[PDB]
Design a protein around this nucleic acid. Structure first.
Lengths: 175, 101, 122, 126, 365
RNA sequence: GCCGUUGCAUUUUAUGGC
């Protein structure tokens, strides 16, 4: 990662929390590291705007870089002219996080309720249970995001607190 | 006890060691890390020799659970298990005494 | 004289059917000119889809007047059968409404479709 | 804040005489520290001032009349580069101010949400 | 294996025996016929499976046994269907035959006494069964599921093998051969995928050719691909698909693009092309049969170089929505399940001769 | 297997409506 140049500066400091307010983060470390990767791409993005048209460096190291941005699910395909790459911004990597995509797809009624649902052995995307909120969905995995076979809200067990609630009824009311 | 369904591939006849080597695949939904004993029982009923004519080892399971792949062995006779097997696997299977020194 | 303007071309029509498919996946879709008129009353309607093969067609002429009052885009599609099919629904829907949500997962597709429709309306 | 690339920036009088006398370009320097495509501007107040530095600064005038730089107009006879920009920065919230004059710079730090610049294309946030 | 049975020329098509049976069910969804005496199995949207004997080629299929569920089996561990059954498939040993539909279960049936020998919960509210396909001379069930899944079972032991993910809409059609691979479509994603089960890989072929470029063709001399309705596997090295606009696409395993696409087949009737509602090939051959609600099964002959195909003909004996095609041999007996509506509960328009039943057509040599 | 209709006279064969 890299720290930004100025640590305390008014229009940027409040611009932190309006990112922390919508997305629901916990550390500006999880903001700065995202800008850090966007920093390294963007320097490379300006490199291929200097060289010649139809350079195979501008082809092979350009278009695959363009297609990888379509592959991560950020660059829409209409803007596929390598001139929207400068017009990228911070929230689009924040938008492709595994936490926020849960709330967009119904099912969470918050961005903070979905944060708790990541770390409790719930929702998987493929057959792998994901419990890191920054899993960065690749746009070919959206309509596989679903409740687990186990871990209720998905069924076949009601769980240790629902079974304990069942246990209380049998011992005092019943036997 | 969830319909174990032991699958075998890579079967090559090896008559110069009088054996048949093959990769054992253990699918196990809703069942975790079954055995080494039941595996030798349940693959000897597709080759129909005996339990102690069956050697098996390996078995690093799939991440998360539900699949296990090891390495399996079958011989033609009981005395071949006493000659062609390693000395500690026969102690592991029970077919020998480990003379500790 | 035309009564079927504007009517969309091919790839825009399948594009619209896919957007309606994910919209029906995200319950962000209204089914019926009754419901669509109600959404035009509540101002929640993004844009309106109408069929061209509906007999009669004059039951569906109220939506351009109400949309042009509310400044809302609208484009005809040729099939009511496929327009029903894109609802995740096995019997035809003559007209569908797109509802407003800024928290929508499919919002960029909706803005691109509104770009094509609002391009065609001029 | 809601500011997007492509950025738009205002080049006043103090900027060009710090660019040439430090040999750092106008447009290609602006693409460096803003990291996107830049849309430079010059007003009528700023350019007609540099006609008064004419016989000693043909160099600054012959660079400013290049089609990389765009034309912008205001309508007052008597205004300055200094005061006319502050009205432009007031009624809209989407310009970037480039300068080095401290006498103008203190009129920029008061209105919130206004990006500044530095010695010739080495940017700084608000 | 490759294509070796070359008998498209031997088919006497013009004097094929055409017959039709009316049956006591509304909207039969599928038909599956066993070949080791020959059997037949039909499921309808009237919640019923019916077993026929078709070993006598000159006769219409006579009734052996039939079973119909009801609203008793509302929960999902009940041994009976309580909604529309979308597909049916018979096991290659002739011992079992399994049904499933909108009740999101899988009920394995005995062929002998017609008894519910197994019920399996799919355990998903979107795990609706759409197409069941068995590997030839095997018992590994391939289950197309509406939650975009492919679920693999074993029959003799009644277990679960593994699940394939990946599609973007509902998997309608899946076809298989004796090797361990299958073809699937997702039917609105406008692609098809080849699935290697032990390799656990997929090869993704892409349709969606724009008619706009075809308008370029209209300058050189149509209709939209929107839904790849069916897929069928001719050999282990090529396959075919059927679309929503009359185009029938021939596909090679070495070709990302369509190696062929046939333009409008069942025709039109702004204008509406017919849907390719049925598609079944004779295995390892050059002959395949496509069906519509237009009223005539159109049969086609693959060229020897696997590059184009040519018209064998039309059989007009079957009016109504053809849902599923079965072909058995010894001579050839063609059966077709004609329902009043489409398989998916879809709407159908103004069909001449609204009838329900089975089409039979015998072709010699 | 709901209804109508035809040849065998209805089992058999062909067709129209719900």
């Amino acid at each position: 990662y890299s720290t930004p140049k100025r640590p305390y500066e008014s229009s940027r400091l409040d611009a932190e929390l309006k990112l922390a307010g919508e997305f629901g983060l916990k550390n500006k470390k999880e903001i700065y590291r995202i800008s850090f990767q966007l920093s390294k791409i963007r320097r490379a993005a300006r490199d291929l705007l200097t060289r010649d048209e139809k350079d195979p460096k501008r082809l092979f190291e350009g278009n695959a870089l363009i297609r990888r941005l379509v592959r991560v699910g950020v660059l829409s395909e209409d803007k596929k002219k390598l001139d929207y790459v400068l017009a990228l911004k911070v929230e689009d990597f924040l938008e492709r996080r595994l936490q926020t995509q849960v709330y967009k797809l119904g099912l969470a009624k918050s961005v903070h309720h979905a944060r708790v649902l990541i770390t409790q052995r719930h929702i998987a995307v493929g057959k792998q249970i994901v419990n890191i909120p920054s899993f960065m969905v690749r746009l070919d995995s959206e309509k596989h995001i679903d409740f687990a076979p186990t871990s209720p809200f998905g069924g076949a067990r009601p769980g240790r607190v629902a079974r304990r609630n069942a246990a209380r009824k049998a011992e005092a009311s019943g036997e | 006890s969830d319909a174990v369904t032991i699958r075998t591939r890579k079967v090559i006849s090896n008559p110069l060691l009088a054996r048949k080597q093959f990769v054992v695949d253990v699918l196990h939904p809703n069942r975790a890390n079954v055995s080494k004993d039941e595996l030798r029982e349940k693959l000897a009923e597709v080759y129909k020799a005996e339990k102690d004519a069956v050697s098996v080892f390996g078995f690093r399971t799939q991440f998360g659970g539900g699949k296990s792949v090891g390495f399996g062995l079958v011989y033609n006779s009981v005395a071949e298990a006493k000659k062609f097997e390693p000395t500690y696997r026969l102690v592991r299977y029970g077919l020998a005494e480990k003379v500790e020194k | 004289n035309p009564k079927a303007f504007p009517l969309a071309d091919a790839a825009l029509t399948q594009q619209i059917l896919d957007v309606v498919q994910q919209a029906a996946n995200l319950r962000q879709l209204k089914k019926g000119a009754n419901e669509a008129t109600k959404t035009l009353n509540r101002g929640i309607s993004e844009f309106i889809i109408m069929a061209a093969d509906c007999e009669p067609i004059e039951i569906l002429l109220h939506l351009p007047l109400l949309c042009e009052d509310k400044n809302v885009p609208y484009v005809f599609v040729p099939s009511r059968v496929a327009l029903g099919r894109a609802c995740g629904v096995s019997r035809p829907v003559i007209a569908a409404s797109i509802t407003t949500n800024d928290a929508s997962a499919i919002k960029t597709q909706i803005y691109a479709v509104k770009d094509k429709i609002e391009t065609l309306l001029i | 804040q809601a500011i997007k690339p492509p950025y738009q920036v205002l080049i006043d009088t103090n900027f060009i005489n710090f660019s040439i006398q430090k040999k750092v370009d106008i447009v290609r320097g602006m693409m460096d520290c803003l990291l996107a495509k830049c849309n430079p501007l010059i007003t009528d107040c700023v350019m007609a001032e540099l006609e008064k530095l004419g016989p000693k600064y043909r160099i600054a005038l012959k660079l400013a009349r290049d089609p990389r730089i765009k034309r912008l107009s205001c309508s007052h006879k008597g205004t300055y580069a200094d005061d006319c920009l502050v009205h432009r920065v007031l009624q809209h919230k989407c310009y970037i101010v480039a300068t080095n004059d401290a006498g103008l710079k203190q009129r920029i730090r008061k209105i919130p949400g206004i990006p500044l610049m530095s010695v010739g294309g080495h940017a700084y946030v608000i | 294996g490759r294509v070796f049975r070359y008998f498209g020329d031997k088919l006497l098509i013009s004097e094929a025996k055409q017959s039709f049976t009316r049956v006591g069910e509304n909207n039969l969804t599928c038909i599956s016929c066993f070949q080791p005496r020959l059997f037949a199995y039909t499921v309808s949207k009237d919640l019923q499976l019916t077993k026929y004997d078709i070993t006598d080629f000159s006769k219409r299929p006579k009734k052996l046994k039939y079973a119909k569920g009801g609203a008793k089996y509302i929960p999902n561990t009940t041994e009976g269907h309580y909604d529309e059954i979308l597909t049916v498939a018979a096991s290659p040993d002739g011992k079992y035959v399994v049904t499933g539909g909108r009740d999101r279960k899988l009920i394995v049936w005995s062929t002998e006494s017609l008894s519910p020998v197994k019920v399996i919960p799919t355990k998903d509210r979107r795990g609706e069964v759409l197409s069941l396909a068995f590997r030839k001379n095997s018992d590994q069930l391939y289950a197309s599921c509406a939650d975009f899944k492919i679920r693999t079972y074993s029959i003799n032991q009644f277990s679960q093998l593994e699940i394939l993910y990946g599609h973007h809409d509902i998997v309608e059609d899946i076809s298989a051969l004796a090797m361990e691979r299958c073809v699937t479509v997702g039917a609105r994603d406008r692609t098809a995928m080849l699935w290697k089960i032990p390799d656990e890989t997929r090869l993704t072929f892409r349709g969606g050719d724009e008619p706009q470029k075809l308008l370029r063709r209209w300058m050189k001399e149509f209709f939209c691909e929107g839904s790849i309705d069916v897929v069928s596997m001719v050999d282990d090295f090529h396959f075919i698909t059927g679309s929503d606009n009359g185009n029938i696409c021939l596909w090679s395993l070495a070709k990302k693009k369509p190696i062929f696409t046939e333009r409008i087949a069942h025709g039109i009737l702004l204008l509406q092309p017919f849907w390719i509602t049925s598609l079944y090939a004779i295995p390892y051959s050059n002959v395949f049969i496509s069906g519509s609600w237009s009223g005539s099964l159109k049969v086609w002959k693959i060229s020897d170089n696997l590059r184009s195909f040519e018209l064998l003909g039309e059989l007009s004996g079957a009016k109504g929505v053809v849902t599923k095609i079965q072909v058995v041999e010894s001579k050839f007996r063609i059966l077709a399940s004609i329902a009043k509506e489409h398989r998916l509960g879809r709407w159908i328009a103004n069909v001449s001769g609204a009838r329900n039943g089975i089409y039979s057509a015998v072709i010699d040599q």
